[PDB]
Amino acid sequence: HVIFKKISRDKSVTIYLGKRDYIDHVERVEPVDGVVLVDPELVKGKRVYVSLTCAFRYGQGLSFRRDLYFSQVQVFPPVGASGATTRLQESLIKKLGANTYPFLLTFPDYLPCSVMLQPAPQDVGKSCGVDFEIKAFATHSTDVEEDKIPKKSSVRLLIRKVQHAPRDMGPQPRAEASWQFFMSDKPLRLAVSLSKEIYYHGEPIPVTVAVTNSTEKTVKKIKVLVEQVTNVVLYSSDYYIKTVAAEEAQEKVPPNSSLTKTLTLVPLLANNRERRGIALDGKIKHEDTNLASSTIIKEGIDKTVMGILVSYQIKVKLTVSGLLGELTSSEVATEVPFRLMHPQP
Structure with a gap:
């Protein structure tokens, strides 16, 4: 001021x-x-x-x-x-x-x-x-x-x-997904929760992941990302999705096994030198500039009047091994929305 x-x-x-x-x-x-x-x-x-x-x-x-x-x-x-x-x-x-x-x-x-x-x-x-x-x-x-x-x-x-x-906040973010791969009805299940629905810029985001692997495959990697999603909703329908934070578990999940772990992510503009293709709150070169805050659309409002919609999500990606006769590993994922903005005034 x-x-x-x-x-x-x-x-x-x-x-x-x-x-x-x-x-x-x-x-x-x-x-x-x-x-x-x-x-x-x-x-x-x-x-x-x-x-x-x-x-x-x-x-x-x-x-x-x-x-x-x-x-x-x-x-x-x-x-x-x-x-x-x-x-x-x-x-x-x-x-x-x-x-x-x-x-x-x-x-x-x-x-x-x-x-x-x-x-x-x-x-x-x-x-x-x-x-x-x-x-x-x-x-x-x-x-x-x-x-x-x-x-x-x-x-x-x-x-x-x-x-x-x-003043208030939405419900605790939670997601649950399960997959059955070709030729086996054995499920791989993933449950994900975040500690809360709004995070502040610079605040660590604890992501709790629970993998229940009933399959014959190994979960070779668990990777957690913050993705920024930008939708331009006036004039041209442009779409951007960018990773702004990422952490791997450094642990595997063997066949017929389970694992729960919490990983912490901090989505920051400084996490990457490349500043193009990302929604920001000001000029790229300027020292005060941060990642854009989540769009908050008022009830009843036609979202197009926002011009640009910015949202954030946690994406959890599981790499799963190929079985005999398969050419490659594969990857499955789920996403859980949360909102990012500056602190309460």
Whole structure:
């Protein structure tokens, strides 16, 4: 929470914000409270507005944009319907003087959080993302042109809407699968549970695996992955699935035997140098960027308005030996969903 500002090229309009990241914790979303400082000489006879846009973009030329949300207020001249100021606004107004005007722009309940991706060379889709922008600008008209908007009198700040955990949590994640292979009705059974349904970024995820092997085959390897799954749901139906964490059991399951073991995974952007083809919450090169949080779709909402859907799952893969006359080993797997986001506020 450092105060930062941006001044228009012509110095007529300056925007101040108290932070870049706005917390969505499901129950509510922190609104964008700020102030605009104007040069009274330069905005004489003009109107100054501030807008908040959430936009989905697609395309590395070819491009698509949809405004998922837009809100705008007039800050100058004062309209007189601003409501109560926040401590931040009061502080800045006191310090900066009377040419300072507060704005409050709220988020609705139906938007995604900050997410973006850049395709890897093997991916077919194009770059896309959800961006949030605060813009302050002056408008004026002449005898000729009505309500003009010069770039020199405008100023933009990019902000983020970041997913933090809600108060409650879903049921404990559990999965159960069983397989019968060709020529034997003897079952291989796998039960998997996670300690809970929401994990925070950087939090270890304990995966309990129980293998009940009634078959003649050996379980040669037990591998556990966190997979990120991304579905682009506007403009182009692109799909990505990426391993963002992986651990092997370092133990086998012989024929007619059982094994229960708990393995711990921590899905992290830092786990891999390759950052393309993964859903992130910001620019690849930027130091603050993390894996994108799970999408949380509000009840009743058409999921397409989210633009990009991000989900996570634990995948448990069992490698099973081939019997005599078989050419290769084989692999079976099951998956168990969980949600990943930032801590409760």
